[model samples]
Target chain A: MCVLTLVQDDVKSDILKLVLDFIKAVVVKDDEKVAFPEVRHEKKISFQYKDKQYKELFCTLYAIIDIYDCYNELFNEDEGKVSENEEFIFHLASDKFKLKQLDMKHLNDLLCEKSYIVSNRHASIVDIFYFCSVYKPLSEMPAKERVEISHIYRWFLHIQETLVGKFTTLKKLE
Target chain B: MCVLTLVQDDVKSDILKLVLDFIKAVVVAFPEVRHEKKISFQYKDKQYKELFCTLYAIIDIYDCYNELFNEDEGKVSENEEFIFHLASDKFKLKQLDMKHLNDLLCEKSYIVSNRHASIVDIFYFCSVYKPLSEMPAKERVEISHIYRWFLHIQETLVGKFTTLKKLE
Candidate 1:
């Protein structure tokens, strides 16, 4: 019989690749200081070893992705959705690994951004930066209407809509 | 020489049961009157947070189920496989003895009350509840069918993601 357990390793590897591919697309633009406002860093972060820092982040993100993949495979027949939880990631870091003085909350936020960037393949560097820096949610708006006050908001929405249009075109070309 | 691809019927049925069990737990708690929240929809009976947590718990239990079967697949005799195929939904569960199905439920004491069931408890039940020889054929076929329908319903519910935050 094709045992479900036998395929876990394969599933994990696939998930790792997907996550790494996501990180790669985002990290290449790190030099430009790509802004991701959705990703909240509990505190400012500075690391001496940039390469080491990215690798550590990659490992943590990979582990989180693996957990989701495992859950999806086991319960959802690989069809169910699993999201990375910032709190759960921290709990895993502190309780499972016994690590201290870590900034996983920020790392998780970056992971979330990267996941978005990767899924929206047509999103450009500027598109990502703008979204992260100034993308205000609908909930943030006042209950009452606000006229076009901020040019930045208009610009960001324009770019977002354009990128989505681009995505549709890209799909058509495929 | 058990070929894994050949037993998709068996595998699909098992998955259906697991998913249905989860839906059964959640549907009983769902309500028409719900408040719109940012990330979760709130109802008088239950919150989205609880539903998400329950889904996670179900996923965990399923992993244990896979582990148990992986370890025990070799123990299943040839006659047992034949019986499984005969009792499979492909045959409308006709060969399945109703008494055997009833006894199977008797052994599955865990299903009596889903309330207060911990993640560990659910997983433990999945691991021990149905051995190949003692499994109920009729229940498997019916539950699996129900599970497929539940999955379709789930897709529609989750398809309406309000924003990126709700994607998860």
Candidate 2:
């Protein structure tokens, strides 16, 4: 099957629609941005979602991104930039309270100054690679994906605008 | 201005239209199972905007899914699930390539070893989340300012079915 056929038959189009809908749900479900006018966040229109729930979710997600920032600093940094190793250390700090791709490792052969611990090379290598991909901050999201999200965001905002135009405000909290 | 005024405005709708177009692009761009006479891969249906260089322009978007394997003892385990950490690792080795992120610190450092070493955190935490809310995989993708490539796969049989129907 040629790529064009994929498009013409609307198979691709259908999938794209599904993906967009998914994005719409994903974005709205966060409880992060509420469209109701209970609070004066924007003035003209106030949207409020529970701030506490959003903060937790955001922090975790932020942790994952933090890992990526570390990787980028180490790998994608310019000359005279922070030393790659130093950046890597900062990125992988343990106190962050997030378990991503970084913490998994086998027993180490080189004993710690305090105690003896063996190392398994394979798991450690795997962890390093996992850390890099999940958090790289580059435009590496690819052309197709960039296009997909751009469209999804546009539609979501459009819906919000429509809603605001219609109701405008919350008369009272139910 | 009122809440209603912002919703009815063209700005939001325009943004939505752009979002729709992009979603269409991601869904449409997938691998084909077989070949046909007239329908070619090279045909450009829409004018793709030139935003970056040829290299940065094309990205490998990976489909985030459960990987059904684990590496232990040499024999591949069947019906076993990949731990999320390992699954993410596998995608990197297989799809993202091993060079995407780097470790800036030297080995065996207290600060680097215990407190920091994750790459995913920075990319998602810093650039994407500010004016935006917090992060979850679903919402996280929304804030991730980086570009993404096509990650979905069309089953071979599904392709065959579509291919057959198209000629009809």
Candidate 3:
């Protein structure tokens, strides 16, 4: 019988607490004007530093979750549609942004510098920057319009039409 | 050696496959896209039924992780700043708008409609419309403004200071 022991770490516990505080600050219960995010000093902002640290942890775990979810969703489809990997990359990029503030422009420039969709495979920092550079100005559009813009299916359709004249393979990765 | 025999179940295999997929999809790279969410739809969403099943799974697991994170984080003073139990509730009759959709709205209206935020509470989706509703036009503006507005820390302070008299 194989046994696994879950060792509890104090650092992890402390980080978890900070994450909760950050979450509480943002989510609201009613139409009340109160919102949790504070960009400046507030009587409420005493909690900011801890929130920042926990956000990094969240980024690590969330990036993993997003990628996993994308792969699961996209794996069964054809390459003409988004591969599970592409979808995962996009989702991972979203949470990574939440974790750190990397001068948005610098981040965007980095992504453009890279070649493949999965750029800088070894370095997460490089990958993060590459993603932001490519998808800069990450949508502030209405949630509805966003839904239209980010659809994998629509994206594939547009890609095929756009590439019919430009590229070689109609077959894409699944 | 402690060994317990467990019954065979198809769901466990499905979970194993999920683990395998997740491992393969790991983006050993990092990136950023603020105030944006990537919804990894594994397939074209069914036009009918709204597939509450998958949605529920997502929501339930998210909530569970969020709750666990909060409980652990709140236990420490140093970690307290990072943790937020945002007091989010579902309904606010005072600010009700036509924009609110029914199928989605009704669920929260039933459970969270009258709820209030505790200091420990965090996150709530007051929007009632199900996924089917045609997204409205102004949605992007609202989301973008929210992103920029939230990040304007210096402006927020100045604005708040200007309103100090009103506070009195």
Candidate 4:
């Protein structure tokens, strides 16, 4: 099938849209500055189901962004790859963001089940480059639309890369 | 007087607009990919306004290079920071390619902002040295480029950077 056709597939669109909405939730509406208000107060945002709030989900998402940003800057060539150690994620959570292990785990499972990442034998957090391509088309999208879509795209890649170090073992046993 | 105005003051429309344009340039042309290739790259107003626009444009320029390099996987500079690879092509600096750029900035007494400083800082320690306790915090900020580098190495290279030594 053509690449365009595959991207247009309903399942992929739904998945991409689902990921996009979660990202949009974190963008504060202040016209003046970039305020991640959710970073404080430890609030909850529901996704994929009702009555199931993902605790510290925004914080978790922010961690994903920060981790990849850190990873890309520090390491020269490893692109979006992350390690497969829960301790790694915990370091960022407990030390930097003040989140719990369980909170990280829940976010990890949500990301994996939703197809944001795949664990390899080397146990590296690998970006499902498949999703990377999905967002590739947003360059042509309108500015507002492109911004939201790219945020989700970047989030997926970063989350997958960051979560690799935090949750690789959890999924292997399952 | 207000935070917004302060942001507005430091962020002149021309410089901000220029920075924004540089940011926009780094996004991928893919119609489907959501185009965040730009976000991974960072730019600072100080670097653009104080130094050459060509210098501040490094983030976007590097992104452009990486995009092509990642796609082709060819001729990547294993010897120097990714910027060196681009610099060799853009400028005529042969020997001391990376150091040449560093010294030029230093000669101007340009205190590297946190953003640009990170590019130099992250590359140096990640490649050259790994420390145990504190990195030399000699920059304008409380923790220098060295400290930031140490934090990055600790967070990312826990297994390999094991023999790191703390300062006495």
DockQ leaderboard ranking:
4, 2, 3, 1
Prediction 4 global C-alpha lDDT: 0.29
Give Cα distance to truth, residue A118, candidate 1, Å.
Answer: 23
- Each prediction's TM-score versus the true structure: 0.21, 0.17, 0.18, 0.20
Q: Write the per-residue lDDT of candidate 2 for residues A60-171, one digit (tens) a residue.
A: 2222222222222222223332223223322333223232322321111121221211112111211222222222211244666544344322322333333222212212
Quantify all predictions' global Cα lDDT against the true fold: 0.29, 0.22, 0.26, 0.29
Candidate 1 per-residue lDDT, tens place, A1-174, comes to 100111121222222333333333433234445321112222222111212221122222322333233322212222222232322222332242222223233433444445332223333322333242232332244545323323334444544444332111111110
What's the lDDT for candidate 3? 0.26
DockQ-derived CAPRI band for the predicted complex in model 4 = incorrect
The TM-score, computed over Cα atoms with residue i paired to residue i, of candidate 3 is 0.18
* TM-score for the A chain of candidate 2: 0.15
Each model's DockQ?
0.01, 0.02, 0.01, 0.02
Positional deviation of residue A87's Cα in model 1 after best superposition, in angstroms: 22
How far is each candidate from the true structure, as Cα RMSD in Å? 22.0, 25.0, 24.8, 20.8
Lowest lDDT sum, 10 consecutive residues, model 2 chain A, at A1-10
Residues B1-168, model 3: lDDT tens digits: 111111122222222222222222321111111111222222233210111122222322233323223334342222222122111121122223323322233343221222321111111121211211233546533333322322221122222101111110
Q: Which candidate is the best by TM-score?
A: 1
Native-referenced DockQ of model 1: 0.01
Per-model tally of clashing residue pairs: 2, 72, 42, 16
